């Protein structure tokens, strides 16, 4: 079964850093489209993505602060968040869009991890 | 059961190319070039490509890839516009009702080509009239008493046995068997989805180019081929002053690219999220147009050869549509040395051109309706059989003795003003009601960059304006239904108008149904209708962007 286990969330002080992990099972993350979203009374907004070819893309609000990486051996995707703002407070969801070509579009979402940034 | 992804990127690219490239590229574009100023015609045609067709290709591909839905269910982004997707699905089914009959003509001619004496070379057959004249002894493109024209109309169509659309007669068993073969091939191409269709397009989408290459290499060597090529490319810049040249370029671009027909969205719905659909749109649309331009060289090499053979000018032999490929080209083949090989390869090329376009058109219906109803998604083989068998049954009309009249009516009305209006409505939906800025955010999420200002401006103003212009001219340029010297009865025109309106009224009908089914006040119903289905919880919070001027001023 495809499972995305979010971890690493918690309370941070404005300007602090946090490393969110996403332990993935059922597929290889090194060929998958792994997307991070967040949902603060607001819609779920894309945060960052590490794509099937390894390309890392980011949303404008987080570009230059967040860093998405993945560990092939651990089958884990990391969202390293620095310079956190009170506007980053939300439930961060790790999402797999698909495992590339010759795969399935398991638009599977983890349960999410709450990140709270206190001014 | 998650949606599957293309086995390879080449599968997707070849599916898109095979759908885009078809008999139109070959039998319409070169004639338009020749009769609209030659190389000068490339100016309006390339202009419209760049500013309308590439933008629409890109929009449909990005929409399908981002939402991974068919033409109908993609309108979760704008619920009021699902009637547009229903209309395009209906139009695709309608088109398949007669497109497969042209493919069946190609198959019939291929079967006829498996002889050392092609049936269209000489007279003295059962289908020949007493007035048949040996073409060596012989405006010309419509003479109708040559062995090739007689073979087509009296031994393929058996059109001499039908007085009109009122006396179409019974289906002809030979064309019936050819249609059965076509539909069986389509079913076994489509019954397992992209996993097999993407591999079938490896053959169907590439074989036409090998045949085109050999045809070019041989034709350029034919006597008089240079004169035909000069007629093809002779530049008359004064033709650009005429509105008809620009209308022809716009219509050719819209119908040859096939953007907004529900097929490209269905194909892109099987893409991986990070696929670069911008580069794919550019490459595939460019391939379509360049294929048209290149095939024109072979077509007019053969046309110049025929004009030289008959001691006539190019205008006396220049023809388009079924006339060209089924009368003029076969006669030229029969004149060539090794005519059997040339006929076989030419009609294999016609089959390959048609089969993948029919595949794309049918996949539009299958994906769009399977996304709408989960039962159809669960039963792909059964639903594919239903679609193909319905297409076969309703194409039985077009293989009757007067099936050419039914086919003319369908070719006129199934995907003319109706498809133009549907594509205008979906472009308007995406770029105005959903938002070009929202669409750019979606593309950024998929590909890491937002589409440039040029593409957004195209989507919001130029593609909509182009589509409205083509719709308006199509309505203005309605000429009562006719075929050759036959003039259809008024009731045939009414039937064609009903066919066109059947898909067009689905848009207002669905909007009315959505408004009445939705619960709440007038403004609540409107907000739910224009709000993405995954944002409907925001409506209760009175947070609707479409009710603010900023959303509509987004550029
Ligand atoms: C072949 C293409 C032509 C249309 C195919 C049938 C699609 C319409 C059937 C249908 O479900 O109509 C409902 C009523 O809309 C209408 O009134 C029909 C417009 C749509 O309603 P819905 O889309 O909410 O139904 C969710 C269920 N798929
Ligand atoms: C893009 N080139 C392909 C055009 C071709 O597409 C098909 C073919 C078969 C079935 C359905 C469709 C939409 C078409 C032919 C006539 C009218 C409209 C479309
Ligand atoms: Cl074309
Ligand atoms: Na075409
Ligand atoms: Na094709």
Describe the structure.
Chain A is mainly beta and 119 residues long. Chain A has a single domain, classed as Immunoglobulins (Immunoglobulin-like, Sandwich), CATH 2.60.40. Chain A contains no helices and 12 strands. Chain A has strands at residues 3-7, 11-13, 18-25, 34-39, 45-50, 56-58, 66-71, 76-81, 90-96, 104-105, 108-109, 113-118. In chain A, strands 2, 4, 5, 6, 9, 11 and 12 form a 7-stranded mixed β-sheet that branches. Chain B has 555 residues and is an all-alpha fold. Chain B has a single domain, classed as Amino acid/polyamine transporter I (Up-down Bundle), CATH 1.20.1740. Chain B has 26 helices and 3 strands. Chain B has helices spanning 9-20, 23-27, 29-35, 42-67, 82-112, 147-156, 173-190, 194-204, 207-219, 225-233, 243-257, 263-268, 277-309, 314-317, 322-335, 339-372, 374-378, 380-395, 403-413, 417-447, 453-476, 490-504, 506-517, 522-530, 536-540, 549-553; strands at residues 3-4, 482-483, 486-487. A two-stranded antiparallel ribbon of chain B has the order 2-3. In chain B, strand 2 and strand 3 form a beta hairpin. In chain B, helix 1 packs across helix 13. The longest helix of chain B has 34 residues, at 339-372. Chain B is globular and about 80 Å long. Chains A and B meet through strand 10 of A and strand 1 and helix 20 of B. Strand 10 (104-105) of chain A pairs antiparallel with strand 1 of chain B. The complex binds phosphatidylethanolamine, (3R)-N-methyl-3-(2-methylphenoxy)-3-phenyl-propan-1-amine (A1LX4), chloride ion and sodium ion (2 copies). Phosphatidylethanolamine (PTY) binds at residues 82-83, 86, 89-90, 93, 372-373, 506, 509-510, 513 of chain B.
């Amino acid at each position: 079964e495809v499972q995305l286990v979010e971890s690493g969330g918690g309370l941070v002080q404005a300007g602090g850093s946090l490393r969110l992990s996403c332990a993935a099972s059922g597929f290889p993350v090194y060929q998958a489209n792994m997307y991070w979203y967040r949902q603060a009374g607001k819609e779920r907004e894309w945060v960052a993505a590490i794509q099937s070819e390894g390309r890392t893309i980011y949303a404008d609000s987080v570009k230059g602060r967040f860093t998405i990486s993945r560990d092939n051996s651990k089958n884990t995707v990391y969202l390293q968040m620095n310079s956190l703002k009170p506007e980053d407070t939300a439930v961060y969801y790790c999402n797999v869009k698909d495992a590339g070509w010759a795969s399935y579009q398991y638009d599977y979402w983890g349960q999410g991890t709450q990140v709270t940034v206190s001014s | 059961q998650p949606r599957e992804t293309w086995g390879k990127k080449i599968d997707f690219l070849l599916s898109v190319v095979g759908f885009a490239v078809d008999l139109a590229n070959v039998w319409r574009f070169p004639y338009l070039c020749y009769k609209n100023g030659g190389g000068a015609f490339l100016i309006p045609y390339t202009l419209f490509l760049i500013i309308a067709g590439m933008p629409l290709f890109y929009m449909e591909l990005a929409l399908g890839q981002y939402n991974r839905e068919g033409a109908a269910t993609v309108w979760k982004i704008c619920p009021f516009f699902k009637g547009v997707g229903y209309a395009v699905i209906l139009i695709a089914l309608y088109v398949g009702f007669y497109y497969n009959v042209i493919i069946a003509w190609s198959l019939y001619y291929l079967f006829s080509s498996f002889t050392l004496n092609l049936p269209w070379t000489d007279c003295g057959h059962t289908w020949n009239s007493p007035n048949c004249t040996d073409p060596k002894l012989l405006k010309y493109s419509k003479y109708k008493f040559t062995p090739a024209a007689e073979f087509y109309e009296r031994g393929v169509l058996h059109l001499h046995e039908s007085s009109g659309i009122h006396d179409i007669g019974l289906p002809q068993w030979q064309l019936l068997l050819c249609l059965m073969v076509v539909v069986i091939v389509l079913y076994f191409s489509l019954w397992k989805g992209v996993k097999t269709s993407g591999k079938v397009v490896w053959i169907t989408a590439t074989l036409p180019y090998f045949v085109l290459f050999v045809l070019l290499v041989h034709g350029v060597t034919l006597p008089g081929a240079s004169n035909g090529i000069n007629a093809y490319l002779h530049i008359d810049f004064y033709r650009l002053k005429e509105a008809t040249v620009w209308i022809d370029a716009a219509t050719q671009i819209f119908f040859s690219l096939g953007a907004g027909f529900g097929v490209l969205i269905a194909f892109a719905s099987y893409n991986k999220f990070d696929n670069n659909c911008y580069r794919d749109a550019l490459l595939t649309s460019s391939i379509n147009c360049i294929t048209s331009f290149v095939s024109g060289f072979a077509i007019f090499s053969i046309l110049g050869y025929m004009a030289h053979e008959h001691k006539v000018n190019i205008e006396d032999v220049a023809t388009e549509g079924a006339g060209l490929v089924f009368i003029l080209y076969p006669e030229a083949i029969s004149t060539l040395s090794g005519s059997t090989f040339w006929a076989v390869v030419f009609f294999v090329m016609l089959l390959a051109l048609g089969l993948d376009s029919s595949m794309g058109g049918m996949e539009a219906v299958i994906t769009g309706l399977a996304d709408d109803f989960q039962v159809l998604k669960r039963h792909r083989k059964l639903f594919t059989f239903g679609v193909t068998f319905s297409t076969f049954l309703l194409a039985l009309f077009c293989i009757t003795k007067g099936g050419i009249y039914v086919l003319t009516l369908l070719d006129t009305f199934a995907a003319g003003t109706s498809i133009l209006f549907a594509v205008l409505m979906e472009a308007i939906g995406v770029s105005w009601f959903y938002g070009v800025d929202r669409f750019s955010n979606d593309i950024q999420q998929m590909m890491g960059f937002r589409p440039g200002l040029y593409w957004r401006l195209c989507w919001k103003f130029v593609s909509p304006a182009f589509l409205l212009f083509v719709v308006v001219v199509s309505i203005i340029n309605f000429k009562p239904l006719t075929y050759d010297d036959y003039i259809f009865p008024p009731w045939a025109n009414w039937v064609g108008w009903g066919i066109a309106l059947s898909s067009m009224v689905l848009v207002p009908i669905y909007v009315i149904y959505k408004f009445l089914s939705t619960q709440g006040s007038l403004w609540e119903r409107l907000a739910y209708g224009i709000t993405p289905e995954n944002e409907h919880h925001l409506v209760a919070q009175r947070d609707i962007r479409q009710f603010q001027l900023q959303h509509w001023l987004a550029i």
